[PDB]
């Protein structure tokens with residue numbers, strides 16, 4: 001009855017207390033040295049035992065006794081690789097991890113537990129993997145659907161997963177001949193994630209893939225305003241709106257919890273011009289599986 005690729009979905013094969021123990025193959029900082037906060041791309045071995053699809057997540061159990069004397073609870077991460085993985089052997093999973101480092105209003109430099117465990121992982125070391133988890137951020141069954149994707153920072157992950165299966169891979173029962181559109185919002189150029197891969201896709205399928213970046217510190221619009229994901233979206237407002245009125249249009253949103261706000265601000269302008277209340281309409285879209293959000 002569903003409109004998304006949930007044919008034989010596997011959810012929760014591995015549990016938090018009995019997780020799959022994998023090993024780190026690769027792990028690379030994919031952001032410039034001058035960027036605000038480092039992000040790492042890491043590839044894990046699964047020997048094919050974690051049957052995830054595009055847009056799912058895996059939980060990681062970080063090594064260590066916690067500040068009470070018991071094992072850490074898991075932390076969820078969107079799967080940054082495709083079903084068949086970065087190597088295409090269907091034996092790997094990949095993650096897009098921001099190293100959480102902040103300084104608290106008590107003066108101390110605080111390092112987030114799991115993200116630092118992940119960004120400090122060496123090839124060969126063991127990683128505890130759970131899941132996979134998720135059903136909300138699955139690809140649309142329809143290979144001719146309009147797939148609008150909006151991400152900020154590590155929130156790019158499920159879209160990288162999406163797009164790899166769309167343009168980088170050949171599949172018998174899937175031949176993408178729709179329109180895929182990515183809006184990726186970051187602060188600096190050095191904070192761009194996977195730009196190279198996306199660029200390659202654009203010139204490989206100019207008819208089927210559209211790519212807009214939004215670099216808030218370095219870019220500006222006609223009113224001289226900072227380029228956030230919605231500021232860039234605004235530039236195609238009337239066009240984006242038109243696609244949303246179509247029943248084969250699937251929107252996905254992923255990243256910082258705050259991102260959801262500005263987009264709505266832009267969507268009010270749009271829908272009001274056509275006499276519709278956006279918040280009211282969003283509900284129709286959600287229940288029709290067309291507006292899809294996973295923010296954190």
Ligand SMILES: Cc1cc2nc3c(=O)[nH]c(=O)nc-3n(C[C@H](O)[C@H](O)[C@H](O)COP(=O)(O)OP(=O)(O)OC[C@H]3O[C@@H](n4cnc5c(N)ncnc54)[C@H](O)[C@@H]3O)c2cc1C
Pocket residue numbers: 057075076077078096097098099100102103104111112113114115116154155157294296
């Ligand atoms: C569905 C889902 C998908 C996700 N995908 C990704 C992903 O793809 N990539 C990624 O990097 N992360 C992703 N995350 C978030 C990921 O779980 C974080 O790495 C994790 O929540 C925090 O990392 P940690 O365990 O290192 O920090 P923790 O040790 O758990 O500490 C986090 C806590 O620190 C506090 N805190 C955080 N920042 C500040 C601050 N600036 N000032 C004061 N206090 C603060 C908050 O209370 C927060 O709960 C995802 C989360 C979800 C729910």
